[PDB]
Amino acid sequence: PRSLKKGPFVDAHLFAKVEAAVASNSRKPIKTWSRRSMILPDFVGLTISVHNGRNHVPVIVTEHMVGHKLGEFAPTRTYRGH
Amino acid sequence: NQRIRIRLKSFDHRLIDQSAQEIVETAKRTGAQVCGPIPMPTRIERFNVLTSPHVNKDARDQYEIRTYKRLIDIVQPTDKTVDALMKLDLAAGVDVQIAL
Amino acid sequence: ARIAGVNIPDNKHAVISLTYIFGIGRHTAKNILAAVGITETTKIRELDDAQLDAIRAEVAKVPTEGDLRREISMNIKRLMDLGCYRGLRHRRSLPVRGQRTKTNARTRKGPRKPI
Amino acid sequence: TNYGTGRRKTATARVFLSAGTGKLVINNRTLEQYFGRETARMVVRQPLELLEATEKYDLYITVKGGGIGGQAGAIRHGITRALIAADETLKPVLRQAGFVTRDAREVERKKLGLRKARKRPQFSKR
Amino acid sequence: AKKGMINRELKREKTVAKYAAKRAELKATIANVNASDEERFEAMLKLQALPRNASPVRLRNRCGLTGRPHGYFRKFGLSRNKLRDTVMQGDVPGVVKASW
Amino acid sequence: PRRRVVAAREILPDPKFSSQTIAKFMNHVMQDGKKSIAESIVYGALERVQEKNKVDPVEFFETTLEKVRPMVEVVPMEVRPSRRTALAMRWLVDAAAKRSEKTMALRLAGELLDAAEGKGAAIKKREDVHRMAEAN
RNA sequence: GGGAACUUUAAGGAUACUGCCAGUGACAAACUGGAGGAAGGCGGGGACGACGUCAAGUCAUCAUGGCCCUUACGGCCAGGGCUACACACGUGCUACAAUGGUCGGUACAAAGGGUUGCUACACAGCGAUGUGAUGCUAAUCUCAAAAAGCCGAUCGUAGUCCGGAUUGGAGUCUGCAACUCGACUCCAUGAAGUCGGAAUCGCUAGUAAUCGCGGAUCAGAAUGCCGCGGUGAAUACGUUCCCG
């Protein structure tokens, strides 16, 4: 994982959108391609449409998600059996 | 105690020997004493190159390139010695470094 | 002798005997023995009661059997409920740390299943 | 007084032989300190044992390169050459013993397409 | 290789050259311990705000004649296909067939 | 080799007793080049035997080897003198392995001491080989 | 301080030719043995591939005849994939232990890499590593600890003080960024496996077997590939059988 001396990594545009919504109290989902951004405590209570390669999947952020990356909740491969 | 140190580098040991002989003769003419030439260890670099355009991993060419080094010491310089060394011509393929 | 609820062998050295408790390895065993004051080569059979309760007090300070198994189970169950990538791998019983599955996944998969 | 040089598998030994009463020193160490396995010590002592002269010489030995076996062989070769350089007439006996020959076997190079000098990767028709 | 890939490599090289000094200064500020933690965080943000092609990890070595991206040999700057042909006809100084 | 005859390789006698039998036995014992371990095992076995009975190791060993030496291999084919010693030392090596003493040197010493009296696993190995030898 | 002896470094030379002796062969070629010699009958290894074969491989290194596309089969970007997983095969690595595991002490290499690099030493940390600082453009300083080996203690045949897969938790570093999908460190966990069916592979000597070390590619990422040394065997009567 990323070294603690550097702190969590969040994309600037995603952080700007999140802080704008939280300064406001808007409710429509935030659309993003930033699968690599870490989920911060400010994200809790928001719905984010994360790209998964061909679509945007909605993710409702809860408390326990803090400390994960956004991409962990949008799987990319489709498998149902042989 | 003014000592001149000359280091010769080359990719060809015959060329480097020719240059060293020329330098030592030029110095002995002016009459300063010489030490050397001393041969330093040679460096060898090897390369493995695939010869087929697409797929034959066992068909390869092995090449190499060597770097020869010679060391020359000049003691008790004569005034003419440094000028003769500087007027000595630069042979292609041999690199000469002079330190005082 | 009974320590932490299991019977460790009595004819072995203490550092090897204490590793028979779930949640204790060689490093933890030698740490406990050094902290209490018993030599690492002393067998359990030649340990008096007082040192036995001394060891028990130290073992009380680390999660050993039921607490540790419960904690591990809770950690796995939380991932499975959350539904992240690792939770999906745990649900499908597949490698979790990025190993290949086209071949060589038999520890997670179990023995081969004929078509 | 007399000198000898020995070589065996990239090992080199310098041997100085003089007249005295049997002291032996290798790299400022005794034989038992320098060599741990006893067969190496027997290999070192073979030339003087074969001559019944182990208490009539001093040996001063330096050795460099190789392993334990190579160094023992080099020391034996150097002792043989030093003895020959002291008495010429001794050479037939040492040559009969086989100590005069310089062993020329050396590690073979790895070759392209092989795992080792000779070992070849596993082959399959199908 | 296609002409587009070569022009892409050229464009990335130009961007790396253009943003060289600012990135080094930012990294020095980051690794500076005397500056305030606010300053270090601001430098981290500025470094993350640069264009992606400014970073040198996105450069790939290509053959100087054909642009091939595999088998590079940094010493010569040529991929294996051109290296073999240039060596075997004598235009590379010091390189010979190796045997030992 | 379809044209040639290759001379048998000649090995040096051991440094301690100057016995090629002991040297060849040591080479049979050795695995993957650990001659130091092989020497330790063989010399320990001979030393233990000498402590048990004050007999010189070289003829002690060759006498026991002659006793275990078979005249016929395993279905009887006929063999050459070198093969005799080959399979004799081969069987001798195995019996000490399945013996039960703590150190291999002691195990080999026990095997030799018991084979010297005919009560050795190598001995019944030879007996079974012979029993199938009278078959044909 | 000094010496130019020895080792080494690396250029140039000498040496081996059945040359000498004893029999054979055919009255030859050749073959057998001995001396001297570092080496004796081609001393060991490498590069060098005849006339030709397979419409063998490569239009994706490159060049090129012909055919096809042209607001698209050309060009720019972000995210994903090449890493999937009921299965089958090829090539490897690590094991199943006592000729061994662990702990303490103590020896002996070769070759190769280093200035956007390698780092002595001190301090901090269990450790990956971090901070300060010194030398090196290198037979000068450094990577660097060789490992197997030897001496001593312990373990006493147990799925074990064997083995080290998988999983939980906590970290370091490279990088704009380690979710898919990096390497490494620590604590915990401790799977299969007790030598492998029919069958099948490599190797004739410093070889096989076994032990460690380096490099190209490369920000990071080798159990692969190309190299280096340490220890160091067994067996060949012969040409019926299998293959070319």
Swiss-Prot record, chain A:
One of its GO terms (molecular function) is rRNA binding. One of its GO terms (biological process) is translation. The keyword RNA-binding applies. Belongs to the universal ribosomal protein uS19 family. It comes from Acinetobacter baumannii (strain AB0057). It holds the Pfam family Ribosomal_S19. This is Small ribosomal subunit protein uS19. The lineage of its organism: Bacteria, Pseudomonadati, Pseudomonadota, Gammaproteobacteria, Moraxellales. GO terms for cellular component: cytoplasm; small ribosomal subunit. PANTHER family: RIBOSOMAL PROTEIN S19P FAMILY MEMBER, SMALL RIBOSOMAL SUBUNIT PROTEIN US19M. Gene3D superfamilies: 30s Ribosomal Protein S19, Chain A (3.30.860.10). Keywords: Ribonucleoprotein, Ribosomal protein, RNA-binding, rRNA-binding. SUPFAM superfamilies: Ribosomal protein S19. Protein S19 forms a complex with S13 that binds strongly to the 16S ribosomal RNA.
Curated annotation (Swiss-Prot), chain C:
The keyword Protein biosynthesis does not apply. GO terms for molecular function: rRNA binding; structural constituent of ribosome; tRNA binding. Keywords: Ribonucleoprotein, Ribosomal protein, RNA-binding, rRNA-binding, tRNA-binding. It comes from the Bacteria. SUPFAM superfamilies: S13-like H2TH domain. The keyword ATP-binding does not apply. It holds the Pfam family Ribosomal_S13. GO terms for biological process: translation. GO terms for cellular component: cytosol; small ribosomal subunit. Residues 91-115 are annotated as: Disordered. InterPro entries: Rbsml_uS13_C (IPR027437), Ribosomal_uS13 (IPR001892), Ribosomal_uS13-like_H2TH (IPR010979), Ribosomal_uS13_bac-type (IPR019980), Ribosomal_uS13_CS (IPR018269). Belongs to the universal ribosomal protein uS13 family. Part of the 30S ribosomal subunit. Forms a loose heterodimer with protein S19. Forms two bridges to the 50S subunit in the 70S ribosome. PANTHER family: 30S RIBOSOMAL PROTEIN S13/40S RIBOSOMAL PROTEIN S18, SMALL RIBOSOMAL SUBUNIT PROTEIN US13M. Located at the top of the head of the 30S subunit, it contacts several helices of the 16S rRNA. In the 70S ribosome it contacts the 23S rRNA (bridge B1a) and protein L5 of the 50S subunit (bridge B1b), connecting the 2 subunits; these bridges are implicated in subunit movement. Contacts the tRNAs in the A and P-sites. This is Small ribosomal subunit protein uS13.
UniProtKB/Swiss-Prot annotation, chain E:
One of its GO terms (biological process) is translation. One of its GO terms (cellular component) is small ribosomal subunit. It comes from the Bacteria. Keywords: Ribonucleoprotein, Ribosomal protein, RNA-binding, rRNA-binding. SUPFAM superfamilies: Glucocorticoid receptor-like (DNA-binding domain). The keyword Magnesium does not apply. GO terms for molecular function: rRNA binding; structural constituent of ribosome. The keyword Cell wall biogenesis/degradation does not apply. Binds 16S rRNA, required for the assembly of 30S particles and may also be responsible for determining the conformation of the 16S rRNA at the A site. NCBIfam families: PRK08881.1. Part of the 30S ribosomal subunit. Contacts proteins S3 and S10. Belongs to the universal ribosomal protein uS14 family. This is Small ribosomal subunit protein uS14. It comes from Acinetobacter baumannii (strain AB0057).
From Swiss-Prot, chain F:
GO terms for molecular function: rRNA binding; structural constituent of ribosome; tRNA binding. It comes from the Bacteria. GO terms for biological process: translation. Signal peptide: none annotated. GO terms for cellular component: small ribosomal subunit. The keyword Ribosomal protein applies. Keywords: Ribonucleoprotein, Ribosomal protein, RNA-binding, rRNA-binding, tRNA-binding. InterPro entries: Ribosomal_uS7, Ribosomal_uS7_bac/org-type, Ribosomal_uS7_CS, Ribosomal_uS7_dom, Ribosomal_uS7_dom_sf. Part of the 30S ribosomal subunit. Contacts proteins S9 and S11. One of the primary rRNA binding proteins, it binds directly to 16S rRNA where it nucleates assembly of the head domain of the 30S subunit. Is located at the subunit interface close to the decoding center, probably blocks exit of the E-site tRNA. Belongs to the universal ribosomal protein uS7 family. This is Small ribosomal subunit protein uS7. The gene is rpsG.
